[PDB]
């Protein structure tokens, strides 16, 4: 909780953590078990991408810096 001042930033961090957590479980389940492989990988990296997007915005290193 770096930016505790704004609850929106906290909500963002929470959202990113939620997505990251979900992606983590998806990866664990993915490993635990032609284009279907890519589709499945993406489906498993759904939370991974969500987290990356939320991080790029939270930190503002992939959003603020570049679109």
Annotated domain spans of the chain: 1-67
Exp. method? NMR
CA–CA distance, 16 with 21 (Å, rounded to integer): 8
CA–CA distance, 18 with 48 (Å, rounded to integer): 10
CA–CA distance, 28 with 57 (Å, rounded to integer): 26
CA-derived radius of gyration, the chain: 14
Angle between helices 46-58 and 7-32 (to 10 degrees): 150
CATH of the domain spanning 1-67:
1.10.287.170
∠ CA(33), CA(16), CA(31), 5° rounding?
10
Contact 47, 19 (CB under 8 A): yes
Report the half-sphere exposure of 36 (CA within 13 A, side-chain side).
1
CA–CA distance, 53 with 49 (Å, rounded to integer): 6
CA–CA distance, 58 with 13 (Å, rounded to integer): 7
């Amino acid at each position: 909780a770096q930016i505790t001042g704004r609850p929106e930033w906290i909500w963002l961090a929470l959202g990113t953590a939620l997505m990251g957590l979900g992606t983590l479980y998806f990866l664990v389940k993915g490993m635990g078990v032609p284009d279907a492989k890519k589709f499945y990988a993406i489906t498993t990296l759904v939370p991974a991408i969500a987290f990356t997007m939320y991080l790029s915005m939270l930190l503002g290193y992939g959003l603020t810096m570049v679109p």
